[PDB]
């Protein structure tokens, strides 16, 4: 079924998921000169103080680090949001070369990878009811550029050998997601969708202005991962990013 190759990659997704062609799809190009600075946007409140990670899993499209979301332990509030959104997981999208890999672009510039911290609106009781709502999800997106090592990222990089193929998981407790944040929390925000099937239009995107840098050896490890399951022919998990979609009647507000 879907994936990222020539035969099953994003330009075919519309045949099984018609909403691919919809009105509020992500990612988009952020044109900085056309973004509306909006001084009513409150500051973001990221409270990742009591976050509990549980495991890391290769799901055949990316690796995800899952968090215990049965209590308000790691939450996002403020900014463009109303209500509290709980952290349930984070994943990355990366490229086969350092000059591509982000999903969102800034003035058409692509970064090496993009981190998504996925949150769901607690108003709706669980993630499953939240993906049935226009304001059910908030994804915090962070660009990664190649440069110095991000020390807080190393823990994730060392375990990737344990989960090389589709379906494997490892326990991954006590990981603190605060080590992945930039100094500045300035952002752009617009309404969009998930960037992989089912491509539901449930998401308030918050894309941070400031990138974090990781070294080439760190993003290099991402590329050694596999799309295939164990014992199937190896396909390297590289280029698992969707192309920018038409913004069509949406405006990107900027907090700066
Ligand atoms: N790239 S992204 O951040 O926009 C995401 C892609 C998929 C995401 S999900 O795993 O949280 N939901 C996928 C679903 C699972 C069950 C019902 S929909 S978040
Ligand atoms: Hg929705
Ligand atoms: Zn994503």
């Amino acid at each position: 079924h879907w994936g990222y190759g020539k035969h099953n990659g994003p330009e075919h997704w519309h045949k099984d998921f018609p909403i691919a062609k919809g009105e509020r799809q992500s990612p988009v190009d952020i044109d900085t000169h056309t973004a509306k600075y909006d001084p009513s946007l409150k500051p973001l409140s990221v409270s990742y103080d009591q976050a509990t990670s549980l495991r890391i899993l290769n799901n055949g499209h990316a690796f995800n680090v899952e968090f215990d979301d049965s209590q308000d332990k790691a939450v996002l509030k403020g900014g463009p949001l109303d209500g509290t959104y709980r952290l349930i997981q984070f994943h990355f999208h990366w490229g086969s070369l350092d000059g591509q890999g982000s999903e969102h672009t800034v003035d058409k510039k692509k970064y090496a990878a993009e981190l998504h911290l996925v949150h769901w609106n607690t108003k709706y009781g669980d993630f499953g009811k939240a993906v049935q709502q226009p304001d059910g999800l908030a994804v915090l997106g962070i660009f990664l550029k190649v440069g110095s090592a991000k020390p807080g990222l190393q823990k994730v990089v060392d375990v990737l050998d344990s989960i090389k193929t589709k379906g494997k998981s490892a326990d991954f407790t006590n990981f603190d997601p605060r080590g992945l944040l930039p100094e500045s929390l300035d952002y752009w925000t617009y309404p969009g969708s998930l960037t992989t099937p089912p491509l539901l239009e449930c998401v308030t995107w918050i894309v941070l202005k400031e990138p974090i840098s990781v070294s080439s050896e760190q993003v290099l490890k991402f590329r050694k991962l596999n799309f295939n399951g164990e014992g199937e022919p190896e396909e390297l998990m590289v280029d698992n990013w969707r192309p920018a979609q038409p913004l069509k009647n949406r405006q990107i507000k900027a907090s700066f």
Side-chain angles (χ1 to χ4, degrees):
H1 191 323
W2 71 270
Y4 292 94
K6 180 172 64 168
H7 291 116
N8 68 345
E11 64 292 317
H12 293 259
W13 292 351
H14 73 98
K15 289 177 283 170
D16 279 295
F17 303 95
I19 196 163
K21 297 260 179 288
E23 304 290 77
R24 181 201 151 160
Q25 294 283 292
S26 296
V28 296
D29 179 42
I30 282 149
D31 187 14
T32 60
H33 291 293
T34 318
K36 223 293 186 179
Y37 165 64
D38 182 333
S40 317
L41 246 38
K42 287 130 292 167
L44 273 174
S45 180
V46 192
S47 314
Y48 289 166
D49 177 43
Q50 307 92 279
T52 308
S53 54
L54 302 168
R55 65 125 100 118
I56 177 162
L57 163 79
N58 172 334
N59 68 13
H61 311 299
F63 60 89
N64 300 167
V65 173
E66 303 166 344
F67 287 78
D68 175 28
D69 70 340
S70 55
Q71 314 274 276
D72 280 9
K73 285 177 181 196
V75 299
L76 230 195
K77 297 174 204 275
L81 313 171
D82 289 281
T84 308
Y85 288 70
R86 278 181 196 148
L87 177 65
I88 174 167
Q89 61 101 333
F90 75 68
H91 47 273
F92 299 74
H93 293 267
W94 56 96
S96 47
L97 290 323
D98 293 352
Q100 59 185 62
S102 61
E103 295 208 294
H104 286 85
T105 45
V106 185
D107 295 317
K108 298 289 181 64
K109 176 210 178 77
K110 302 187 173 72
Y111 286 84
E114 186 171 325
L115 169 58
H116 294 150
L117 294 121
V118 180
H119 312 64
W120 64 269
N121 195 335
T122 58
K123 179 200 301 176
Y124 300 116
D126 57 59
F127 186 88
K129 270 86 195 183
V131 299
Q132 289 167 65
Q133 308 287 135
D135 66 332
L137 302 192
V139 185
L140 225 193
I142 294 168
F143 299 114
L144 271 66
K145 48 167 289 300
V146 171
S148 322
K150 196 73 179 72
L153 190 61
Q154 200 52 46
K155 284 58 57 61
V156 181
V157 165
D158 288 336
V159 177
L160 294 186
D161 245 289
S162 319
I163 53 139
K164 183 182 166 68
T165 53
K166 186 203 294 178
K168 285 187 178 156
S169 51
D171 305 301
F172 188 72
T173 53
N174 303 109
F175 180 75
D176 188 5
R178 292 183 297 188
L180 304 180
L181 294 183
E183 287 175 26
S184 187
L185 292 193
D186 288 326
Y187 65 90
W188 296 288
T189 181
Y190 73 98
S193 62
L194 301 172
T195 65
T196 70
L199 303 162
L200 300 172
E201 291 179 344
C202 309
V203 189
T204 284
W205 274 99
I206 303 179
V207 173
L208 296 187
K209 182 200 57 53
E210 187 181 306
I212 52 176
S213 47
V214 298
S215 56
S216 43
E217 304 65 68
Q218 285 189 310
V219 285
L220 194 49
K221 310 287 166 276
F222 289 7
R223 296 179 185 138
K224 287 183 168 69
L225 243 30
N226 285 185
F227 277 138
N228 59 287
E230 206 197 317
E232 300 177 355
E234 180 159 344
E235 295 110 285
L236 296 181
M237 184 183 286
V238 282
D239 292 330
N240 54 341
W241 51 272
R242 190 192 192 188
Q245 299 311 306
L247 186 63
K248 58 159 89 173
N249 250 331
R250 285 179 288 181
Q251 188 185 51
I252 297 170
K253 302 293 182 179
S255 73
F256 65 95

